[PDB]
């Protein structure tokens, strides 16, 4: 609410500095005076919850009574037609603002801190699970010769992308808490492109697992030729190369720049950025979400259409993939919707309940990576055994 008011002071100030007449100068002043009075009413973060009559609080409030006074002065001039004089008077109050009140602003809200700590918690929590949980999955598959299944080789691929994903989390946590990116450009590039690799390689593998189940079920004759592990490895590598059609351009495009007191990691789309940004944001929604989903739904639709333990086994393994597919969807469906709203429907983007909910369901996205290894070891018996065998 206050930074909003401080925003309109600054903005109206430079409207006066670019003005050509008394009316439009006057109007601007009259806005600032309102801004400065609703700002005076407000308590700022540096003064989190001091005595409503502490020296520092009395002193902050004073700064505004001063500023207002000066606005009523400039407004007396503009009223009398004295434009330039009103403009000069406006110049001196930018300073009088900064000299007195500015020392009270800039700090982070206690709520905001709480969010940051809450995130760091969840992140650390996800991170400790997923990073562990998928290193196990990756270790378990390679080590034990008994585990080289076509579908399991695809899982390896997921456990890899998920692992890589969950290695970036503490860096994001530190970025949130300390309000800056202290890790340098290379690692900025590393972290973002990893975040994109994670989305595509996952959803492409999950499409190919689905394609895999389908040929398994509906074309068991044909399957024997295409359902080998060596080939799954090949498709895994294809999934990665293909994904690099989106991952490498981000690798280059991602960069580190200083902005308004901090260092921030971000994407740099060739101008127009806001357009190309949307372009990509749509493609990621189509080609890493709906379009692969439609394929999966088809694959699964068709399977609605042999020995004792093998028929039971297919069912169990097939039913596993649907859950991980579904579990995936429900984790990412929230955030993929939110981002498309965020970048098309102009809602209110600074609200507590909004920002939190966004962050609190980006978190769900990343929670998908810690969930996976659990689902593997609770819906696959061989995984269930291995995980409680170790310890």
């Amino acid at each position: 609410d206050l930074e909003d008011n401080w925003e309109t002071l600054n903005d109206n100030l430079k409207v006066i500095e670019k003005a050509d007449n008394a009316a439009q100068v006057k109007d601007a002043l009259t806005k600032m005076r309102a801004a400065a009075l609703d700002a005076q009413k407000a308590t700022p973060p540096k003064l989190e919850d001091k005595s409503p009559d502490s020296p520092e609080m009395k002193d902050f409030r004073h700064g505004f009574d001063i500023l207002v006074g000066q606005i009523d002065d400039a407004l007396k001039l503009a009223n009398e037609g004295k434009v330039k004089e009103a403009q000069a008077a406006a110049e001196q109050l930018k300073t009088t603002r900064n000299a007195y009140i500015q020392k009270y602003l800039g700090a982070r809200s206690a709520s905001s801190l709480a969010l940051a700590i809450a995130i760091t918690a969840l992140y650390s929590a996800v991170c400790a699970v997923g990073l562990l949980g998928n290193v196990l999955v990756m270790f378990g598959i390679v080590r034990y010769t008994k585990m080289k299944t076509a579908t399991n080789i695809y899982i390896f691929n997921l456990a890899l992308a998920d692992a890589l994903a969950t290695s970036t989390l503490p860096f994001q946590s530190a970025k949130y808490l300390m309000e800056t990116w202290p890790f340098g450009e290379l690692l900025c590039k590393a972290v973002l492109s990893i975040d994109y690799y994670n989305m595509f390689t996952s959803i492409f593998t999950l499409t190919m697992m689905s394609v895999d189940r389908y040929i398994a079920v509906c074309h068991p004759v044909k399957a024997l030729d295409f359902r080998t592990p060596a080939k799954a490895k090949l498709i895994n590598i294809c999934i990665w190369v293909l994904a690099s059609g989106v991952g490498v351009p981000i690798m280059v495009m991602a960069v580190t720049r200083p902005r308004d007191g901090a260092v921030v990691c971000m994407l740099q789309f060739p101008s127009p950025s806001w357009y190309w940004d949307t372009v990509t944001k749509i493609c990621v929604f189509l080609f890493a979400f709906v379009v692969p989903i439609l394929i999966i739904t088809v694959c699964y639709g068709l399977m609605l259409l042999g020995s004792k333990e093998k028929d039971r086994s297919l069912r169990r393994i097939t039913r596993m993939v649907l859950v991980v597919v579904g579990a995936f969807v429900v984790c990412w469906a929230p955030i993929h919707i939110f981002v498309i709203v965020w970048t098309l429907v102009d809602i209110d983007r600074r609200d507590p309940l909004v920002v939190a909910a966004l962050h609190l369901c980006i978190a769900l996205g990343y929670a998908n990576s810690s969930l996976n290894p659990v689902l593997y070891a609770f819906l696959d018996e061989n995984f269930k055994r291995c995980f409680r065998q170790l310890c």
Binding site: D195, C265, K281, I335, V339, I362
Partner: peptide, 4 residues
């Protein structure tokens, strides 16, 4: 995902 996502970011600036």
């Amino acid at each position: 995902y996502x970011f600036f």
